[PDB]
Amino acid sequence: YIAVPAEILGIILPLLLGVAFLVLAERKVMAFVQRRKGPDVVGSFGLLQPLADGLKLILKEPISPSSANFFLFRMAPVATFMLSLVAWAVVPFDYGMVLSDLNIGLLYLFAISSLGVYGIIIAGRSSNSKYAFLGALRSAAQMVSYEVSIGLILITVLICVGSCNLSEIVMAQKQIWFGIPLFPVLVMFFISCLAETNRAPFDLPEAEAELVAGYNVEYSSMGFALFFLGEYANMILMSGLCTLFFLGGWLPILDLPIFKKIPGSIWFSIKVLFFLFLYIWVRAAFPRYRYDQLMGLGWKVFLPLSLAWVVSVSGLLVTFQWLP
Amino acid sequence: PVMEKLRMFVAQEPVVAASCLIGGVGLFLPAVVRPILDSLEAS
Amino acid sequence: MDLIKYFTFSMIIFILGIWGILLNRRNILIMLMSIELMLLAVNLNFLVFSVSLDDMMGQVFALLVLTVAAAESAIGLAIFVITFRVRGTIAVEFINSIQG
Amino acid sequence: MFNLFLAVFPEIFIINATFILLIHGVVFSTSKKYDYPPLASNVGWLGLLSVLITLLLLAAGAPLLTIAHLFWNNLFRRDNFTYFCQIFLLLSTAGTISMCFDFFDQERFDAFEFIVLILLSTCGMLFMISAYDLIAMYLAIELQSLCFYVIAASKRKSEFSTEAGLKYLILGAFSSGILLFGCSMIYGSTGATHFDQLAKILTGYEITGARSSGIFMGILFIAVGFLFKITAVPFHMWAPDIYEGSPTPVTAFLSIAPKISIFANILRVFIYGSYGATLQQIFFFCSIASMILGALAAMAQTKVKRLLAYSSIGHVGYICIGFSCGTIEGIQSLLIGIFIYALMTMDAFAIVLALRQTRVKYIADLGALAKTNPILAITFSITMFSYAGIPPLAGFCSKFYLFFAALGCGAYFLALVGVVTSVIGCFYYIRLVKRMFFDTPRTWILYEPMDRNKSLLLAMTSFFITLFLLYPSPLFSVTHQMALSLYL
Amino acid sequence: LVWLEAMLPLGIIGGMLCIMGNSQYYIHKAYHGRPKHIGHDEWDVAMERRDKKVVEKA
Amino acid sequence: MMLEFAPIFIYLVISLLVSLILLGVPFLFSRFDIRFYLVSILFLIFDLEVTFFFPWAVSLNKIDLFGFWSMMAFLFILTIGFLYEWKRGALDWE
Amino acid sequence: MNTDITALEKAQYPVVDRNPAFTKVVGNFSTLDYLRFSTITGISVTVGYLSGIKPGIKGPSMVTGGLIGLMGGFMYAYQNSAGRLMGFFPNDGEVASYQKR
Amino acid sequence: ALKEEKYAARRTILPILQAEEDERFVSEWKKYLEYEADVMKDVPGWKVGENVYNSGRWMPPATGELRPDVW
Amino acid sequence: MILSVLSSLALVSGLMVVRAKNPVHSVLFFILVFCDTSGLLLLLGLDFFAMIFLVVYIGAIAVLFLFVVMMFHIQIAEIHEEVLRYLPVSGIIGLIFWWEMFFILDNESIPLLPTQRNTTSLRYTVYAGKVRSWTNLETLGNLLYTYYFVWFLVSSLILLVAMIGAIVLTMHRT
Amino acid sequence: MASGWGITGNKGRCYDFWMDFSECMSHCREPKDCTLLREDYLECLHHSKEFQRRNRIYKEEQRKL
Amino acid sequence: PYGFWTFERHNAQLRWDPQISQVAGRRDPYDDLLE
């Protein structure tokens, strides 16, 4: 157990670097779509821009408004940041490359998803601003609404696999990736992940121009940074789940010796990178829904479809006795 | 004349119609097909 | 001494619910939360006993009591909302008209 | 496989009919085309029909309800005692529903969900009666209780109805938690939740010196929960406030059906399990407290609904005296007392719902009713004398037992309490007869005549109340059958 | 070809993920002497506890 | 085995420490909306539905057709509830 | 799933078939069974119609009442037919048809 | 099929592992019985290694730990 | 020791649920009591229940409590009362319940005192049970939907009542 | 442990004792005839007498020290 | 009465449990090794 901290740090530090550079990559791909260049002055090809923004942020004076909820105001970004970090303990990157081989890892991921709402709720309430509070309530409602669809899709995958172990879920896709028969389920899962991470076209907190003040409007300096970093770490995680559940995790595209020459971590990384490109591509492509429209989509479109897909998959597998 | 009422109901509400169809196949297979397979296996 | 320690954990939660009833005569929301603390303690009792006896019946009932607790909380807070909406306040002096 | 479910045919039918009514109501109440029609009476008539078809299915399938008893054993237990208890519960629900149509039409209470919740609670009480395991017992009790919490707050803009619902939820959830803690102690001590297993574990020992304190306290807490359910003192103070504050048809329903179902549970749990003396002393002391407190508090009341609530508390005291003695005649008399109290309460609430069209609230509002409606004043006087136990009305039967057990189990303090509280009850019942017949008020309230449903129900129950002691053989035989079928 | 500038932060993220996997994989292997076994159940735990005796007491 | 949860705890502690270092280094240099109650209720109901699906999905290979149809009956009851909520406008936020 | 049809109280009449199949019980429907079925269904349609007049939905109310009556009457007829085949109800005709086929 | 292979492998080596464990437990129980006889010497009425079960059927010695197998 | 730490955390957090001036803080301390309970369940080896207490109690029930309490904007005056006068009645009630129930198992479940001898060597291992072990999840799922399916369905009826009653009591359609 | 379902997916530790006690009580018209089997079942449930005896041993060790 | 436990209504478990005695979840562990 003495080397466990080394493993945990070898997970957490590169994740914080990967998030720093996800912000950069988002600014670069959006720029290129818009015929612009993006950050390219601060470091060669702009590669030192993350470091500069982080150092700027830590050198900013904290504000700490005169609220009766001094402690909760500072604790809310810690809460969300911690929740975003702790989900990676059960994520397998390759065969045997995982910190905790939880037999209940699927339900554990669902539980972390469910805990994610409290940081936003508490930030909104503790800010002593009715705009922040209302924006927070709307964001929390949206998150819990789309968690229902996320959970029912998790149930579909679990029915196919018959085990909550994430490594087992990956290794059950050796015959075929689950995203081929369940391609509509993959589509609905990617959309539900956009709505759960509060990302475009569902990013209410970004719609300040729209008279919608986000839950983190009062935050400055590093609390504001912790909210932003938690949100982006959640996007890489949701891209990793899309990869694990439907694109066969670390497995190669084809069971051929030429494809088995490159290791599984490279396959996993490439699929994660494809999904992160799509998160940015969608932000760059479409306008955003109003709150009532996306709430209607959550309850009236994605709950029914997810439930119907659970019924159809379980019934088809029970009929022909293809169950795990 | 309940044949275009179904047509309108599909036109207005395609997600509901698709959910009913997908879940209905999921219910139909074990209800009907599965006893057919079990009987075909008995003989 | 394992069983006694788990049991006293659950028992302290139950007693805390009782005290929370006893200590909140102006605060009916905390009374509802004290009842939820008692229900949690009972669920813990069932799970601990299930383990101690090597018997599954305590786990089946724990799950069902979970469903019941959720339903009770939803209905309880609905009644709280309509009580507040009618009166404009949650103070106990406005919910004491029926008497004798 | 399909034939196994013949044992749950009545429940399957009533649940599916409830779903059909829920869908029908929500579809046509939202319809702009029909101008959002009030559907409370329509769904009420359809639900009354559903209850009568359920009753037909249950009563005409007496041997089939015991089919597949080993497959169904870990879920419930159907026998003759459950058969008759469920028939009586369905009859109570049908009568209560038939007493609600004028309330739906004239107050314009348009919510059809009222009928749906009544039917769902009827399902819950049906499952309560056949419960044969602590888990199933608790689940059915919770289903019934949640339906009652929601219907107690149905007049959602009324201060009284919201207050009633809030007190019901808090005191009901508290009592349910206490009862659940008792179930956990019993399970931990015996490793068993099934009533048969609990019977085998607990018989032959009772308090044999080395008594399991876990079992004893599980029993005590479960007993506290049951006593809350039957409104026995000192677990009663929720009842008068909820009875007053709830809409009057809710008060009528809560007065009858839950008592039938909870007493079925109490019989099958306690009379059948085996801790013994303490369990009966619990009910003895609570019966005495209930009789005394109910009599005094009713004597203090000036409003009709509160008087009826306190009268019901006193009468459950009288009934529980039968459970206290722990003999065959005790169980028989408990069942007879429940049946007669239910019919009398149905009579009384039919009259109350009839007078609620002119908003009766106080006992003084009944002044000069023998002039404005002489036959209604006679029918109501008959009910009050029956409540007071004056022979040869049906109410005497239950009073007769009280003293029969008091001189049978050898308890003269119980006899003295019964004599004094009977006199007090007689006083506050004949005060209503005095108000309707002897008083000459300056201002009279003229009451609208009742509808056909309530007049027919009133005529039948009044004929029963005056004439039951002429032909009481069927009830005596059937209750003796039920008391025997508890053990064999 | 300017669009390759965008492929650098993405490649750095992919390398960060490859580190998050492989670095923890090689540290566990050094500490235990063999790679981590996926699906360690009660049987494998009991086998390890028995193998300790069968090795050390030999 | 529960052995695999200990790394999660040490991970939590380390994440806490990182959080406090990042947050601390800078310190060195009246309108009730019922629609939120209603969305909470809906979420709670379907949360319990996902909860009851987890054991069913892992146990489908043993419970066979009986288990499938009992879960279908469960879903049917809860979906009738959902249709009631839909027709009553609890799913509309305009 | 292990099953056991055995009842607590034994059948008091010749047991023609212990666990008759669904279609066998439906095919055992007699004239009295159809009379019970039709009476329940007709009463239910009538109650649906009469209670639907005031809200203005007599037709839809008729369909709803008829569905409730159809389910209840079919269940009642099945109950009687299966009880006769199992020996729980007087089953003269069942035994007469059994002793011949 | 893969899981069935692993379960087959575990089933065949089961008897030797159980026999080893049985020998170990018997030797340890003998040692503990000598210890109990030593300590409980001079205490009248003691019976060394008495079976608390009236049926006399063998049960493993209770540990007093609720769930020791999972950790 | 670990059980002592968890018990102490739960005891303080529960006191803060029943004694906090602000009900929002009360709901937040309740989340801490549920987290501690999850830890206890992990110690007992019931990881499914440990996760479900997180998902349902914290993820769904506490959220509903928080939404309602936050939007109510309760003023501290409407719910404030001094609790020094309740120390005697709390003392008697709590002491009776303590002396009677913290020691209810002691006669029935007598604790095994830890001796200065290695009793771990007398743990008997039966390998037959370990060939194909069941998780908490599949052990529960083996029973919920077949042998005890009726109670499962009654719980569904309970949930249906909650949905109906929530709509009927609070809905005001725009 | 009277149901038979063990928490690890096998027969419960105390099921056989329960079944012995039940089978004895099914034909013995006196509960005292099955007292030994009943206390066997309850001993399996709580290990009261076993732990009491081991505590006696520990107490004697502490006394002789 | 004298020994209600003796009656056949009260011995449901003794006749139903043998019918499920081979069901996965309640078997003696050695049964899988020999069968």
Author numbering:
A (entry chain H): 2 to 325
B (entry chain b): 2 to 44
C (entry chain K): 1 to 100
D (entry chain N): 12 to 499
E (entry chain a): 3 to 60
F (entry chain A): 1 to 29, 55 to 119
G (entry chain f): 1 to 101
H (entry chain Z): 73 to 143
Q: What text does the study give?
A:
Protein complexes of the mitochondrial respiratory chain assemble into respiratory supercomplexes. Here we present the high-resolution electron cryo-microscopy structure of the Arabidopsis respiratory supercomplex consisting of complex I and a complex III dimer, with a total of 68 protein subunits and numerous bound cofactors. A complex I-ferredoxin, subunit B14.7 and P9, a newly defined subunit of plant complex I, mediate supercomplex formation. We propose that the main role of the plant supercomplex is to stabilize its components in the membrane.
This indicates a slightly flexible arrangement of the two subcomplexes and raises the question whether the supercomplex actively induces membrane curvature or whether it adapts to a locally non-planar lipid bilayer. At the ND6 π-bulge, the hydrogen bond chain of the hydrophilic axis is interrupted. The π-bulge is identical in both our slightly different I + III2 supercomplex conformations, presumably due to the substrate-depleted conditions during sample preparation.
